[PDB]
Amino acid sequence: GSSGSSGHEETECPLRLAVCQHCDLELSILKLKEHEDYCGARTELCGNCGRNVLVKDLKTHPEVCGREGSGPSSG
Numbered sequence: 001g002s003s004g005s006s007g008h009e010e011t012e013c014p015l016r017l018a019v020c021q022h023c024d025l026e027l028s029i030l031k032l033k034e035h036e037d038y039c040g041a042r043t044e045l046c047g048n049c050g051r052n053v054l055v056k057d058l059k060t061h062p063e064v065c066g067r068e069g070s071g072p073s074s075g
């Protein structure tokens with residue numbers, strides 16, 4: 001596998017990163033604010049109906065989930 005040699009010394013620098021509240025992913029605090037703008041716009045697959053719904057909408061999606069929608073779009 002790998003010989004037990006001295007080994008390389010891995011070091012880390014002090015970098016303050018910000019985490020999202022919707023996706024909860026690691027991103028640059030600088031590109032965080034913006035990242036959110038799109039983050040929400042993104043649509044995920046629901047389990048009840050099975051349609052693409054906005055991340056931020058998923059909050060109150062359950063309400064319209066089941067009643068709203070053309071019908072059986074996909075399996």
Ligand SMILES: [Zn+2]
Nearest residue numbers: 020023024039
């Ligand atoms: Zn995010």
Ligand SMILES: [Zn+2]
Nearest residue numbers: 046048049065
């Ligand atoms: Zn749904």
